Amino acid sequence: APAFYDLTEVRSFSPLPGFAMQAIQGKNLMLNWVRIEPNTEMPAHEHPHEQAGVMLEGTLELTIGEETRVLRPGMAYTIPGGVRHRARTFEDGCLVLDIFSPPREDYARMAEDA
Amino acid sequence: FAPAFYDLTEVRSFSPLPGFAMQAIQGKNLMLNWVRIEPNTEMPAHEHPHEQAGVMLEGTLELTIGEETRVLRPGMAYTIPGGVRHRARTFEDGCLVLDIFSPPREDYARMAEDA
Ligand code: NI
């Protein structure tokens, strides 16, 4: 079903303190607006889902595999399914758009219940 | 594929049609496409088997998906299932929209490679 979204009206959910997420999806795509509070860590994880990210606001230190990059608006990244990554913010926090294919089923349920 | 980081100032631009300037990157299943559209420009009606989503970054875009028409501005987003007909137009300000495809659009991938 084709759809239009206003993100000011998409309810947010928190999988972990310091994170607020607004997730929408089609069949094979999920878009997730992640607002991360200052000085907050996303613990290291992997998943079969391919992921991409687009910086919108603030600063994010991202580790994908062996690499550690500091990311700001104007930057984007791609992560193959199965590749380990973790992240952290500094003083300013960040807003990052995460993209998954296929959608993350756990976030889908949390978005439904938000 | 291999993990990759991109600086948009370094991603080369291509134009599939007058009034459109694009920068595309892709993983395997995902393509991200930054589309700058000139003022008062029409995107002719099309359908594609690829799934599409879009995120407004700057300006204004009137988008028609199947039966519904909406005017989109930053703060808004859209989803288009594979095969669903859509068209769009800009007004005086033009726009910047982030288009997302799964799987990647073959034509855009080739133009990005040649950019
Ligand atoms: Ni992840």
What phi, psi does B106 have (nearest 5°)?
A: -60, -40
Residue A111: φ, ψ to 5°: -65, -40
Q: From the CA of B31, how many Å to the nearest CA of chain A?
A: 9
Q: How far is A111 from chain B (nearest CA, A)?
A: 16
Which chain B residue shows the shortest CA-CA distance from A68?
B5
Q: Residue A101 and residue A95: Cα distance in Å, rounded? A: 20
Amino acid, single-letter form, for residue A22: Q
Inter-chain CB proximity A50 and B30 less than 8 Å: yes
Helices (H), strands (E): how many in chain A? 1, 10
Structure tokens at A79: 């992560």
Chain A nearest-CA residue for B8: A74
* Contact criterion met (CB below 8 Å) for A108 and A30: yes
Residue A84 corresponds to which tokens in the numbers above?
């380990």
Name the DSSP letter for residue A106: H
Out of A1, A74, A101, the one facing B30 most closely (by C-beta) is A101
How was it solved? X-ray
In chain B, what are the helix, strand and coil shares in percent, each to the nearest 5?
A: 10, 50, 35
Q: What is the CATH number of the domain that holds A60?
A: 2.60.120.10
Q: State whether residue A108 is helix, strand or coil.
A: helix
User: How many CA atoms does the CB half-sphere of A54 hold within 13 Å?
Assistant: 24
Which domain range does residue A31 map to? 1-114
Q: 3-class DSSP state for residue B111?
A: helix
Q: How far is the CA of A85 from the centre of ligand 1 (A)?
A: 7
Tokens standing for A65? 């595999």
Q: Are A76 and B32 in contact (CB under 8 A)?
A: yes
Widest Cα–Cα separation across chain A: 40
> B69 vs chain A: nearest CA distance in angstroms?
9
CB B111 within 8 A of CB B22: yes
Residue recorded with tokens 């948009």 = B8
At B82, is the secondary structure helix, strand, or coil? Answer: coil
Rounded to whole angstroms, the maximal C-alpha distance in chain B is: 41
Deposited resolution, Å: 1.9
Three-point CA angle B24, B27, B28, nearest 5°: 120
For residue A59, how many C-alpha atoms fall within 13 Å in the half-sphere facing its CB? 9
Q: What gap in Å lies between CA A50 and CA A112, rounded to an integer?
A: 22
φ, ψ for residue B87 (rounded to 5)? -150, 165
| SS3 (DSSP) at A38 | coil
Residues B4 and B74: beta-carbon distance below 8 Å: no
Distance B72 CA to ligand 1 centre (A): 29
Look at chain A and report how many structural domains it folds into. 1
